[PDB]
mmCIF file of C-alpha atoms and ligand atoms in Angstrom:
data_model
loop_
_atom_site.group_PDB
_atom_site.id
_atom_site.type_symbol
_atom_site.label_atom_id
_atom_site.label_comp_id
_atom_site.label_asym_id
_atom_site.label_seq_id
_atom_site.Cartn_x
_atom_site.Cartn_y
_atom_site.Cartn_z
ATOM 1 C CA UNK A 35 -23.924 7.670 -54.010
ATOM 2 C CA UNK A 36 -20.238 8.266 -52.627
ATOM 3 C CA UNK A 37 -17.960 5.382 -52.772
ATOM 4 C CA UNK A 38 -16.275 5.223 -49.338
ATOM 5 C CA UNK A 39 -13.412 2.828 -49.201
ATOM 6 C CA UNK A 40 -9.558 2.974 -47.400
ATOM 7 C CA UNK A 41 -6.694 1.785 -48.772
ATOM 8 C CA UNK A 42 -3.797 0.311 -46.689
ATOM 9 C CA UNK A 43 -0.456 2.360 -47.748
ATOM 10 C CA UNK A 44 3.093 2.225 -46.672
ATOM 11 C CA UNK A 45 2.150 5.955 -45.025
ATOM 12 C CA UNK A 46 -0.873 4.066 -43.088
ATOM 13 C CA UNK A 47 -4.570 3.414 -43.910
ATOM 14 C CA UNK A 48 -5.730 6.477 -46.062
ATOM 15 C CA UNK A 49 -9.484 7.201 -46.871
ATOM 16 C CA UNK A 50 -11.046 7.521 -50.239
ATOM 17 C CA UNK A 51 -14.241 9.117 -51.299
ATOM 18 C CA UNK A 52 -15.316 8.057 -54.476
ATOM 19 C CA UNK A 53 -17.854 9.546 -57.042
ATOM 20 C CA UNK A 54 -19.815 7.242 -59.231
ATOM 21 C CA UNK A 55 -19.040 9.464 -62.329
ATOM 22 C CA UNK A 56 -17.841 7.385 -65.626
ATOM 23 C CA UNK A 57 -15.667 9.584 -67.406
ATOM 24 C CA UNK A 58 -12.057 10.568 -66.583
ATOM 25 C CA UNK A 59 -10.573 10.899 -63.568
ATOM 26 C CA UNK A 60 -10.397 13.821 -61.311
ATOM 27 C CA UNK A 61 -8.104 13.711 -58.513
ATOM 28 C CA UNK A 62 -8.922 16.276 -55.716
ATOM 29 C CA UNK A 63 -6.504 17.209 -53.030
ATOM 30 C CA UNK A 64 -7.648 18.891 -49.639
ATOM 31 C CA UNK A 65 -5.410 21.604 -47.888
ATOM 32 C CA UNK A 66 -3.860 21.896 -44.068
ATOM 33 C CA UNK A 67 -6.277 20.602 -41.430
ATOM 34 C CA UNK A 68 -9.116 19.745 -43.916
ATOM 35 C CA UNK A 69 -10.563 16.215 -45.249
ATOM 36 C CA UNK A 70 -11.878 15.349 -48.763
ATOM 37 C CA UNK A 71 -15.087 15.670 -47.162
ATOM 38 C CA UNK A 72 -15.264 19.361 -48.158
ATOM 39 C CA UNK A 73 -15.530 18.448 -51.481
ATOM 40 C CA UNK A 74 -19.070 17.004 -51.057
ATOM 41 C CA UNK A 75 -20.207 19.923 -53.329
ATOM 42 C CA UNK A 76 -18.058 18.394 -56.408
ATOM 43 C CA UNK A 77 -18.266 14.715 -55.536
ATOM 44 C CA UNK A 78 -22.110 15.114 -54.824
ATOM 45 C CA UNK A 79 -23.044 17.516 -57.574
ATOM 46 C CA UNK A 80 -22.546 17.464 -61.440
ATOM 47 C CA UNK A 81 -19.057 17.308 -61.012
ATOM 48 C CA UNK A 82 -18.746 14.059 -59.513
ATOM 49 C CA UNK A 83 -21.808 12.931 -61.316
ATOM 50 C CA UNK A 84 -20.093 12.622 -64.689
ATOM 51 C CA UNK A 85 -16.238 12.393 -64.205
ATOM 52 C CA UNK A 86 -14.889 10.010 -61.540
ATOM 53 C CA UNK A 87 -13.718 12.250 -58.571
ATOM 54 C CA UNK A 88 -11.470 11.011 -55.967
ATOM 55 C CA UNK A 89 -11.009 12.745 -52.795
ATOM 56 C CA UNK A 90 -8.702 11.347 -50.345
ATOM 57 C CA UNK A 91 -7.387 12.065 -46.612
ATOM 58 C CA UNK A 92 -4.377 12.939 -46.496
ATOM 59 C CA UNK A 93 -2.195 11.320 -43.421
ATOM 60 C CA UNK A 94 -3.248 12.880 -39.953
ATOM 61 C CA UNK A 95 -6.161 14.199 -41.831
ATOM 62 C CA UNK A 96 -10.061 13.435 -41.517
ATOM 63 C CA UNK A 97 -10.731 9.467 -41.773
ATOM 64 C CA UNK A 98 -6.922 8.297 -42.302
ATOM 65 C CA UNK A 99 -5.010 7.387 -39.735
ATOM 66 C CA UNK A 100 -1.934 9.367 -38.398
ATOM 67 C CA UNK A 101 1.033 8.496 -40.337
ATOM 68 C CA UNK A 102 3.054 5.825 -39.856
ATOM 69 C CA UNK A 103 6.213 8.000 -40.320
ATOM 70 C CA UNK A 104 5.843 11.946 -39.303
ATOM 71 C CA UNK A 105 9.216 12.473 -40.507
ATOM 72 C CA UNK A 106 8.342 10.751 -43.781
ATOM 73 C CA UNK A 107 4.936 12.074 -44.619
ATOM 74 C CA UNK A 108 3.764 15.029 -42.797
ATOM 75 C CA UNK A 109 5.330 17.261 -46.137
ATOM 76 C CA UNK A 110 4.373 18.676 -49.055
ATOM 77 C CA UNK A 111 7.018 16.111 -51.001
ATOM 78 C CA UNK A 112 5.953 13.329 -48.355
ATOM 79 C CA UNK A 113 2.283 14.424 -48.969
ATOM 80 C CA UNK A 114 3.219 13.983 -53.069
ATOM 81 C CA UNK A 115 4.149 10.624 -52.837
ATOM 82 C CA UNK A 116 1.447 9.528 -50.616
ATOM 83 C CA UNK A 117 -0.979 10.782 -53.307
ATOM 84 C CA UNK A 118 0.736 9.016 -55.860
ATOM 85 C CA UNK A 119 1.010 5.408 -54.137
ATOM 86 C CA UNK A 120 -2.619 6.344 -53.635
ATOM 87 C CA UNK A 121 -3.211 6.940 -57.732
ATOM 88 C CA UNK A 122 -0.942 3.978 -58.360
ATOM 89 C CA UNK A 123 -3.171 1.530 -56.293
ATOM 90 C CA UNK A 124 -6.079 2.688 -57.738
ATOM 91 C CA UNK A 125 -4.528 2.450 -61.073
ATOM 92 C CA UNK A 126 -4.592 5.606 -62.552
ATOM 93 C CA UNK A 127 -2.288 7.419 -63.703
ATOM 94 C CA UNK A 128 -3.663 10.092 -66.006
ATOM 95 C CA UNK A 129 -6.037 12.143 -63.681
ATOM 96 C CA UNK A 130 -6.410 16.084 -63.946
ATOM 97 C CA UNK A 131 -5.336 16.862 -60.399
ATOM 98 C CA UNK A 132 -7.493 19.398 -58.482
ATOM 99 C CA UNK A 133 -4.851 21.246 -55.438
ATOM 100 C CA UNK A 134 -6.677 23.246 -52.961
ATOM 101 C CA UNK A 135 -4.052 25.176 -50.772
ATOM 102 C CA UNK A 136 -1.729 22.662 -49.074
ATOM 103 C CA UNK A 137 -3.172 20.434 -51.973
ATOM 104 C CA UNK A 138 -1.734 22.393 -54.558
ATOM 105 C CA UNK A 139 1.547 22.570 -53.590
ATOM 106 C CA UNK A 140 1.193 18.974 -53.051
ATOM 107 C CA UNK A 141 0.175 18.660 -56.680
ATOM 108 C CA UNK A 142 2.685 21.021 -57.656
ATOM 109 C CA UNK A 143 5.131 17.914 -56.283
ATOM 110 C CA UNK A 144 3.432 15.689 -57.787
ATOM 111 C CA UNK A 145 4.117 16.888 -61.053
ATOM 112 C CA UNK A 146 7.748 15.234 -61.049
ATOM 113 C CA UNK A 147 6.114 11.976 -59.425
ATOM 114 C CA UNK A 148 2.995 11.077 -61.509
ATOM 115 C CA UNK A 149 4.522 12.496 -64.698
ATOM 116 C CA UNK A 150 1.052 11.066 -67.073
ATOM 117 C CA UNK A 151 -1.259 13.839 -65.019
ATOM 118 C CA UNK A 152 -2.786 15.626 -67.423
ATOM 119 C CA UNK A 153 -3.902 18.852 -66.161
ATOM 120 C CA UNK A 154 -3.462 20.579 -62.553
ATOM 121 C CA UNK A 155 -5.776 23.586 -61.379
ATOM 122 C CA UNK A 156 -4.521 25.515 -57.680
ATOM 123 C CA UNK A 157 -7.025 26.984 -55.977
ATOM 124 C CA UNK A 158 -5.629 28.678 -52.945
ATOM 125 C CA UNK A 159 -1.801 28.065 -53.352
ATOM 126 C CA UNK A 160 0.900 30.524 -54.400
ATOM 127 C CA UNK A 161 3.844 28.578 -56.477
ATOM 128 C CA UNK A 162 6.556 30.348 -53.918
ATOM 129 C CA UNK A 163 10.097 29.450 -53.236
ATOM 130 C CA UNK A 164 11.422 29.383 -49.854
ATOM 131 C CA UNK A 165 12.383 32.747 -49.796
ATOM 132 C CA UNK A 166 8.986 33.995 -51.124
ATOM 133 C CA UNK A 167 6.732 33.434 -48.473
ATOM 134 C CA UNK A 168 6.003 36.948 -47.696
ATOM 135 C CA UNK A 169 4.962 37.907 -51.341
ATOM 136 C CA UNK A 170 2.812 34.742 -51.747
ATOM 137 C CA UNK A 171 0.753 34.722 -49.068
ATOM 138 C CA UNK A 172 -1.302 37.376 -46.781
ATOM 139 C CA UNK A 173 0.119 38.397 -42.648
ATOM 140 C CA UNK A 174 -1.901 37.390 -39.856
ATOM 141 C CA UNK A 175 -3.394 35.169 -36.732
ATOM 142 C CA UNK A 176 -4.602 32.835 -38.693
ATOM 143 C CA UNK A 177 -1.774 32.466 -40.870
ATOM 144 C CA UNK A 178 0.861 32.115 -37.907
ATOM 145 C CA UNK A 179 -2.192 28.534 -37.259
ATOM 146 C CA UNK A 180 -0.969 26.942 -40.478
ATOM 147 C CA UNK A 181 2.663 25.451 -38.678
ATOM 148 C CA UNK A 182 1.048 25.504 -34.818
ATOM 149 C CA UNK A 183 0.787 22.275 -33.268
ATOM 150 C CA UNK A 184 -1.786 22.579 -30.683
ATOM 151 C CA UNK A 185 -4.948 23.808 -31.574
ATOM 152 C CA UNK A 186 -7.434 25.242 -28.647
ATOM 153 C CA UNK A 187 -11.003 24.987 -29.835
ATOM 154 C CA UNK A 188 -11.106 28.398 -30.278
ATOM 155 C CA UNK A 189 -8.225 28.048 -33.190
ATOM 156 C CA UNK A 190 -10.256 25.443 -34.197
ATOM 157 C CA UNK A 191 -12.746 28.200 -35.393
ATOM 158 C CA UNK A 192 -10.773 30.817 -35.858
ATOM 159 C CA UNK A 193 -9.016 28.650 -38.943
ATOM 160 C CA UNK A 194 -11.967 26.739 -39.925
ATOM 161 C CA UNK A 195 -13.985 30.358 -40.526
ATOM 162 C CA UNK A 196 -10.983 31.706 -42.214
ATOM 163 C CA UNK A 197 -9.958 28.926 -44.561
ATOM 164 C CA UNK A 198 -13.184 26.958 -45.458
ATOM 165 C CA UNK A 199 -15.414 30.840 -45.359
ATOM 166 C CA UNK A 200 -19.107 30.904 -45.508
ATOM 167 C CA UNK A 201 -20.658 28.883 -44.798
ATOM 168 C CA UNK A 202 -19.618 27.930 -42.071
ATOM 169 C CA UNK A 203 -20.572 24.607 -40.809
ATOM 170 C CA UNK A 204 -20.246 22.650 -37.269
ATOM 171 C CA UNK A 205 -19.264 19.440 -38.883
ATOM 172 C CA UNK A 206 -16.008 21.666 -40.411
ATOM 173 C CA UNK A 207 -14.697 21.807 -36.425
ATOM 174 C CA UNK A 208 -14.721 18.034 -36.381
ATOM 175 C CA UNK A 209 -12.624 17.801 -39.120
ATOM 176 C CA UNK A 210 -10.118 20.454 -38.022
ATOM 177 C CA UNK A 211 -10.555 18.799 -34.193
ATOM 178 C CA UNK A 212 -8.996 15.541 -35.733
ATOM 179 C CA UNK A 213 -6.097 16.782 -37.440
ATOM 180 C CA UNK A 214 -2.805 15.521 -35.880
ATOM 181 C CA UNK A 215 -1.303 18.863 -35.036
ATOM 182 C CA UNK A 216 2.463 17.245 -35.783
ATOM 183 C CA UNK A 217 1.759 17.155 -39.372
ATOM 184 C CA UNK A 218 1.512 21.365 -39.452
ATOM 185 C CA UNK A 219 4.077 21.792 -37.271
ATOM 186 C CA UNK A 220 6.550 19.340 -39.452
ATOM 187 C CA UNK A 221 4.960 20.646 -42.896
ATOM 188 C CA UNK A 222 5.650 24.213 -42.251
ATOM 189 C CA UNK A 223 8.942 24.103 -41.331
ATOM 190 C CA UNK A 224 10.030 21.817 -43.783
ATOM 191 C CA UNK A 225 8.565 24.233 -46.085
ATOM 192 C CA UNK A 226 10.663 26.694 -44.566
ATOM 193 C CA UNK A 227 13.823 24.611 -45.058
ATOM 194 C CA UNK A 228 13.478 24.038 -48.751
ATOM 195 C CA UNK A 229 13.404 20.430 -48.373
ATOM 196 C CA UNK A 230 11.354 19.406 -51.537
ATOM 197 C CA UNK A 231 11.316 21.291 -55.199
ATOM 198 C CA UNK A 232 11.639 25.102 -55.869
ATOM 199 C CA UNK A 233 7.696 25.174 -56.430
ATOM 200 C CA UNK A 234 8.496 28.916 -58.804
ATOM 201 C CA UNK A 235 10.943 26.782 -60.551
ATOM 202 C CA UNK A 236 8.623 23.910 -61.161
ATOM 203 C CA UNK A 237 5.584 25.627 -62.318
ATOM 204 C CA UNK A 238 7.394 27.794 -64.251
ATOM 205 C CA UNK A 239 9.437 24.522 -66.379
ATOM 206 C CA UNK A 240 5.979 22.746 -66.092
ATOM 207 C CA UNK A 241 4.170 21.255 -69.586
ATOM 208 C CA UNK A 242 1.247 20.038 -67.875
ATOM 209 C CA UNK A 243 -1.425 22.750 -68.293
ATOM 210 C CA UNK A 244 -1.819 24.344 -64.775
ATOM 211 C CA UNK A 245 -5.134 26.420 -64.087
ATOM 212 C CA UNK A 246 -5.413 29.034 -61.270
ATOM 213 C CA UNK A 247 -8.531 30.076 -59.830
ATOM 214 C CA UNK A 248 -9.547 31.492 -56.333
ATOM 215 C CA UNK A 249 -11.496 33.638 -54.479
ATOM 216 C CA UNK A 250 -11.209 37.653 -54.722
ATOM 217 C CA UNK A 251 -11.784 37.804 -50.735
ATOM 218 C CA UNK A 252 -9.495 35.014 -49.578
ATOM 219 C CA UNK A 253 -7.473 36.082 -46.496
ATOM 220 C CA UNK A 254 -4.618 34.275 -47.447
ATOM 221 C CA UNK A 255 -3.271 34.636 -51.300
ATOM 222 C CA UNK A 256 -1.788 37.222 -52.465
ATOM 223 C CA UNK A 257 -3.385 37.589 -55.535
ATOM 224 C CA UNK A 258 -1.220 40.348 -57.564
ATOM 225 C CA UNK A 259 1.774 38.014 -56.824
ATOM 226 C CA UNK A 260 0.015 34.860 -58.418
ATOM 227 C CA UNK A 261 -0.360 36.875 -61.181
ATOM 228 C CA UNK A 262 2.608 37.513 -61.961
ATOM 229 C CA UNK A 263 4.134 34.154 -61.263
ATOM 230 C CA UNK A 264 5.367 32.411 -64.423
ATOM 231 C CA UNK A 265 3.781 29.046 -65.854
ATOM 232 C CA UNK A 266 5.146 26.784 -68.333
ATOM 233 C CA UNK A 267 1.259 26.298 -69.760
ATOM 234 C CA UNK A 268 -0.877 28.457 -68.109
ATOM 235 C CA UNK A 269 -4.601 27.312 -68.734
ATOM 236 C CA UNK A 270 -6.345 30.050 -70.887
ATOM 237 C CA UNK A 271 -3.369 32.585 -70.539
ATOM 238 C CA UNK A 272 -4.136 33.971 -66.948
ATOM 239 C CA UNK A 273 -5.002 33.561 -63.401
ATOM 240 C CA UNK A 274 -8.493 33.655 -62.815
ATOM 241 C CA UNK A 275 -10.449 35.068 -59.980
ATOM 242 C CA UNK A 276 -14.236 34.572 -58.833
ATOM 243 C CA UNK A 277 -15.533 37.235 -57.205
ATOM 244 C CA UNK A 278 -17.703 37.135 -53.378
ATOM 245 C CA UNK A 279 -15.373 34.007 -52.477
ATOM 246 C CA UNK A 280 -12.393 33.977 -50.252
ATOM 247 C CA UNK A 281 -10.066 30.602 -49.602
ATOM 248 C CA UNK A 282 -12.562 28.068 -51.022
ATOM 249 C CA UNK A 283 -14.470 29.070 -53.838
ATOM 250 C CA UNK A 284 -15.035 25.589 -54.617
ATOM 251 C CA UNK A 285 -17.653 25.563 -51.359
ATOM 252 C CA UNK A 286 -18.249 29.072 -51.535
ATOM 253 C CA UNK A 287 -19.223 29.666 -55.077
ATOM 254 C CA UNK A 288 -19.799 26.063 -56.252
ATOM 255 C CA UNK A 289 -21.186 26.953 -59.900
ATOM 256 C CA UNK A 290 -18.907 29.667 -60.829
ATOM 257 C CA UNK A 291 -16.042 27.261 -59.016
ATOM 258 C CA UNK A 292 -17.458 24.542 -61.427
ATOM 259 C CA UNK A 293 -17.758 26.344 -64.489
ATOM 260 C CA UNK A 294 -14.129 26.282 -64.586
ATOM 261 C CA UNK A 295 -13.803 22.971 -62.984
ATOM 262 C CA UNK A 296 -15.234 21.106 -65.750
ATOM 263 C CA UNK A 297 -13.655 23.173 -68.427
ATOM 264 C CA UNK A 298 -10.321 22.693 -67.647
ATOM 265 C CA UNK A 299 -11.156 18.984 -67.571
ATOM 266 C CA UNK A 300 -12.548 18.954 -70.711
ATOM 267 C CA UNK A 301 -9.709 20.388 -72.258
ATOM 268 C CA UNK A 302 -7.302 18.174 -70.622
ATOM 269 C CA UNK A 303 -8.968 15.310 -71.363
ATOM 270 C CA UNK A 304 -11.578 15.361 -74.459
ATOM 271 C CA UNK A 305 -9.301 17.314 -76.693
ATOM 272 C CA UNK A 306 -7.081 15.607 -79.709
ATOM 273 C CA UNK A 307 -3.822 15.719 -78.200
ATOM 274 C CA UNK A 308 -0.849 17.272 -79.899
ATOM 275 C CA UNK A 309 2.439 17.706 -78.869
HETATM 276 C C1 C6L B 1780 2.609 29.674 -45.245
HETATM 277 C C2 C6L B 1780 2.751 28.204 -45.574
HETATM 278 C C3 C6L B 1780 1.413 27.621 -46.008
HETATM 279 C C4 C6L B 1780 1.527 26.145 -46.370
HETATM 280 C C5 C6L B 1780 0.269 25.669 -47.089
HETATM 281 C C6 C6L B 1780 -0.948 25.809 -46.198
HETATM 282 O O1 C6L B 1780 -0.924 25.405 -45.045
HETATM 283 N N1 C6L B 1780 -2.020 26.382 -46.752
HETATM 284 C C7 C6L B 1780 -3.265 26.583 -46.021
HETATM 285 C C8 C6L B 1780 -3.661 28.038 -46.256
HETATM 286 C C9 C6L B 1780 -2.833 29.010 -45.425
HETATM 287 O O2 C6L B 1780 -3.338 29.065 -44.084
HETATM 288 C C10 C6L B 1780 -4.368 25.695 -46.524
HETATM 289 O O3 C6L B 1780 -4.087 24.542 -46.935
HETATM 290 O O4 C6L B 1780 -5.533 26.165 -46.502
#
């Protein structure tokens, strides 16, 4: 059973799934023009059966409602915050956060804002500064969608198929569909201007453990870059990468996604602690 509630938030009325797990929590973090709906494999499946797996809407996304404030949320900072008055109502403030693509540079923000999170995995997401764009991420049609405002229903498909991957479902173009088309236009280019943290720098200063993990066939990361990027703590001393996945392993390759999955929350949360 998922635990569907919404929460009324100074960014407007944001949508939680809830799993009915008991153990820690596990915060999970959707990317550009997706829901926490695509998470049904974790919340539904052993995942979300034994930790306590959160999976919001981001503002403009899925079941919230546009935000109240373009200027103030549509951003991966803006996005940071709203995910943190989200934590904050729900009163938790130690989850291992889970950042797919837009979500993990949003959780790559929050680091600075929800300073008791005890683990972050990015799945998806090259830590890049500004300037960096190019070596992060993969050139191409659907990359020029991630900042485009209007969407025909044809670049509906085009970036559902290319950033959710097989398979591919009708009920993913509903969720793209509804996605207010201000919030990629606003996010990219603020992205572009610099106008939240030097992601490189952050990750790289960073305490928390950070885990990577994505898909060997993901049109969009460039995975020799990642890499090579430097982490404060990076989980298990590498990047990791799961073969016959692209952009979402998670959906693609749910047990191998998993295996790591509950792993890295096990080590950020059921070992002793030492500083
Ligand atoms: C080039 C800037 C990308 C910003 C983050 C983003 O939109 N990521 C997409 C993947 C890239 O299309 C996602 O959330 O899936």
């Amino acid at each position: 059973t998922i635990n569907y509630h919404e929460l009324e938030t100074s960014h407007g009325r944001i949508a939680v799934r809830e799993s009915e797990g008991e153990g820690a929590p596990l915060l999970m973090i959707h990317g550009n023009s997706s829901s926490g709906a695509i998470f049904a494999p974790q919340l539904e499946g052993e995942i979300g059966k034994k930790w306590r797996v959160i999976a919001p809407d981001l503002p403009g996304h899925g079941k919230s409602t546009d935000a109240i404030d373009p200027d103030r949320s549509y951003s991966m900072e803006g996005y940071a915050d709203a995910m943190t008055e989200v934590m904050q109502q729900l009163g938790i403030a130690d989850a291992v956060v889970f950042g797919w693509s837009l979500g993990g540079h949003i959780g790559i923000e929050m680091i600075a804002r929800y300073p008791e999170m005890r683990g972050l995995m990015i799945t998806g997401t090259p830590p890049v500064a500004r300037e960096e764009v190019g070596q992060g991420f993969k050139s191409g049609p659907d990359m020029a969608l991630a900042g485009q405002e209007i969407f025909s229903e044809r670049d509906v498909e085009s970036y559902a198929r290319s950033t959710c991957g097989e398979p591919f479902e009708a009920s993913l173009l509903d969720i793209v569909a509804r996605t207010d088309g201000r919030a990629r236009r606003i996010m990219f280019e603020k992205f572009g201007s610099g106008t939240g943290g030097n992601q490189r720098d952050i990750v790289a200063e960073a305490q928390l453990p950070i885990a990577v993990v994505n898909g060997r066939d993901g049109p969009f990361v460039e995975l020799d870059f990642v890499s090579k990027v430097k982490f404060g703590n990076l989980w298990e001393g590498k990047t990791h990468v799961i073969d016959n996945a692209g952009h979402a392993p998670f959906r693609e390759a749910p047990a191998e996604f998993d295996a790591y999955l509950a792993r890295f929350i096990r080590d950020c949360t059921q070992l002793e602690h030492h500083h």
